[PDB]
Point group: C6
Chain length 220, copies 6
């Protein structure tokens, strides 16, 4: 990663063993459950493209997911290059060349070029751009490896309301879109797919009930 020293300079630091192991173990145990994204984002804090490639290369298995990840990265790399055509010319003494999509992904850039970009003034944050592409890719995988659709979450006749809302939002969290799309899913389904007893109770509460009020009203 790139961290600040006490001189105020952004300097490269080695990825710690603890960071590597934490990422390997969290994929081992949680696969592509939705909480893998924040874990990956937090563990890759300050990462260079090299660090991000290190983390993704240490994943054992799920190689189909990892290949989808590369295809996502390549599309985002192609989009970056078409929005940032590089301008030919000698790079000046105090400068860095402009990065191409393959440079952000680390396939055509050295770690020293990545450090130069990330510690420049102003910085060109190839690590955070790459991370964006990867997390975009991981979001697709979480959505693809989600077993259940939001339309299939229906409260059982003896199922406690808390357990049902747990399943509802767990399912909703794995199909990532805008929250505009997730507010629409809730307003469309959460009360309508409650069991007949709780549904009649919540209809009387009206559309303005908070979730806390809905869960208290269907308590047992």
């Amino acid at each position: 990663p790139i961290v600040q020293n006490l001189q105020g300079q952004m300097v490269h630091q080695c990825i710690s063993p603890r960071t590597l192991n934490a990422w390997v173990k969290v994929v081992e145990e949680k696969a592509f459950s939705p909480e893998v994204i924040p874990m990956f984002s937090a563990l890759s804090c300050g990462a260079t493209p090299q660090d991000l490639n290190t983390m993704l290369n240490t994943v054992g298995g799920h190689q189909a997911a990892m290949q989808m990840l590369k295809e996502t990265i390549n599309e985002e790399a192609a989009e970056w290059d078409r929005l940032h055509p590089v301008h030919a010319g000698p790079i000046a003494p105090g400068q860095m060349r402009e990065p191409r999509g393959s440079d952000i992904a680390g396939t055509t850039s050295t770690l020293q070029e990545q450090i130069g970009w990330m510690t420049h003034n102003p910085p060109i944050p190839v690590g955070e751009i790459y991370k964006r592409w990867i997390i975009l890719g991981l979001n697709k995988i979480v959505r693809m490896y989600s077993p259940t659709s939001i339309l299939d979450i229906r409260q059982g006749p003896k199922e406690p309301f808390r357990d049902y809302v747990d399943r509802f939002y767990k399912t909703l969290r794995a199909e990532q879109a805008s929250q505009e799309v997730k507010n629409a899913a809730t307003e469309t389904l959460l009360v309508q797919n409650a069991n007949p007893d709780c549904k009649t109770i919540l209809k009387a509460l009206g559309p303005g009930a908070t979730l806390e009020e809905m869960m208290t009203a269907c308590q047992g």
Copy 2:
């Protein structure tokens, strides 16, 4: 988090893998027992709103609770906005715009704006305001997920007084309120719900007995 380095400057640091892991593990093992609040408060020491969102996002399961958490956050954010009317105008070169509620919650603010607010002179401590909203929300979840009422905690005819006082205060701590009447639940409900043998001993102790005095008197 934003911590002071070894020289006295407030710097951004990455959330550590141990901090991430410790918070995930505490929710896994303790759910919303009351001791999750101090663990969350201590593990989020110096957190930015991004750090707090990371921690909350790493929680697997309990998504009904996490949704209640967002609704509490949004209520407090709207209250913040109603108390901090917007002042339109170009932000001056040195300084930073006033934060809205969604900026404190981290949904419309970047990490660099959060660093800018938290390291300002004087600092606008968005991380601690956000943290205060979250703990307010987590306190509701603890209250709601507490199974038993204090009026149902009663000493068995053969149950040692110590175990009953353990159950009593464990319950009182989960059923959260101000000390206005929790102070009230002790000293009279604690005696009223003692078994007849210990209850008879505790009347003889008279008003003003310490809990140590009550526990010594009902040992045998």
Copy 3:
């Protein structure tokens, strides 16, 4: 905690995850065995009142003990305030208000006021005063949760002398008082409650025998 930076300034540091976990685990495994006090004292090195409250709030269970702890703290807080009546008046530019008992315990003080007190010149060590009150409270709990009295420690007819002295001083360590009180317990009981064979041997050694000499004399 409050630690020294390399500038010579006492600065606040976040309580580490390792410190929190160590305290939670040691209470989980050792309850209120006497070695909980030094573990708590060492783990709370440099603690602010906030850190001490964090540690005690993370304890799961033993809530009867924790309430006795609060009653001890409140008595010590009441004693502090009666010995340190606060003097009204505007606090000067370079100063801190004088702390009340509730400020030392952290119920009416902010972490910033605790930092101001603890890093003042000279420091007013509210953290070490609070710790004193807490450890005073923990000593009462260790003494209350001790199963055996010193008068019941009697050497068995086939019990090795080392095992008996182990039990004797383990029991003596849980009833904390002055060592004047613990030297008196030893001189009164250790030889007199040895089994008849070892007792006759140790009577001949005389009152001036070291424990090492007594244990060699009753070896087997």
Copy 4:
């Protein structure tokens, strides 16, 4: 390793017990699965040749592979020497002699000469040259210890498409080459070795299908 301290100077540091342990454990559990290469590359960040030799020497077992590793290192060292002819002559007071192949490999160079090369201006990065030779050697070991060929990876008549793509790319990654024909193995061999049900679906998708599109189309 040679890392930058908190002030900006390149200093030698001892390899940490966690780094040593992490590398030993990764070889123990993963042998020469492909993910051992990124683990070795990341754990050897900033390594001197002495550090790299230490890491390789801590490997227990797999001594046939480790001997192949030495033979690869020696071939690269001889290639280095043929490209860097020796210049005889007294080394000047300030500077350091040119490294031979055996010096990069650490067999004829001391740790202080390795520090001298790596902290020179400009640096001669013997640790990264050595690391590049080792990973070249470890890549051969992975290729050799890969049990299955990509031509033998075929989808079963009832095997889900996802599991087959997992096996396909896991295998392709172990059978190491350039993307010249690994790019080639995908998109046609991946389809050719699908079972007849999915194969029929994938012809209808036509050329240019993403892996996400192929995996969505053969879900059911």
Copy 5:
């Protein structure tokens, strides 16, 4: 402990949770095997007397031994006092009073007086004097809790010579003395207590045989 920071100043640091835990665990698993002494000496590197008392106080059980430890400490403290007669007189502004025995042991000295002594110019190293007394006491405990005498360590008729030498020196190390006669126990008692087959071989080796030569000669 009192350690040097990154700038060259001697500063007080809190004993780490790992150091506390490591010492507790070592006593739990190894009791008073000889290797507890180096573990205690290394884990108490730079300790103040308060740190040493903390470590000793965290020991659960073995209270008979811990009481022997106090008696040894008190004997050494009295010897220290008899060699360092008190000089009455007001302590000058810059300097510190001379330490008594109880101050080195930490029973009549505060942590700040211990820091003052240890960081003085020249330093009065009360922590190392205290440590020396404790290890003297722990050495007595190891000697006393060693079950077997060196005269009872003898090679079985079918026991491999290596295992017997292992038992021999393991025992010799627990039965602690100076090398005046431990040097003596080897080379003649080691041969005398060998079984007749190996004993006959070792006479033929003659005086001056190394232990490697003896162990090679009694392999078969």
Copy 6:
């Protein structure tokens, strides 16, 4: 150990708990397998003689090996003293006395004298000299505790060639000598003790076959 601070000064640091435990555990689990030497060398990076004595004193068991270690050290100490006769005379204000063999081994030197030697300009590295003696001793123990001779490694009639080369070089690694001696062992035995099928294949390859080529030729 002796580490560099940020002032450029070599300063003493306490041996970490993690370093102590790592060395104890690696001996516990791996005994004197050959990888114990690099683990010991890496874990004792920067060690003082005191640290090296600490590490070796913490080893439980294998006391016969540890005594052979002392005899090796004493021979190397005797050789050092006969090559470095100390010259009598007052030590100057800015100087350190010359170290004897017993000073390098730490039996007649204080930790402060070891720090003085190791941080002198130029340094006299008693820690690295001692380490050399110890590792010389550990090499003898690895060679003594090796069960199998190189002449007994013969490929089985159904044994895969990789497994046989594994055993061959594992055995060869435990009998440490020069690689001149280990190249001679390979050229003498590796092909000649292959099973009759693989032997005839490798004879045709000729003496110039790499190990990688030999292992591919005897694949199955």
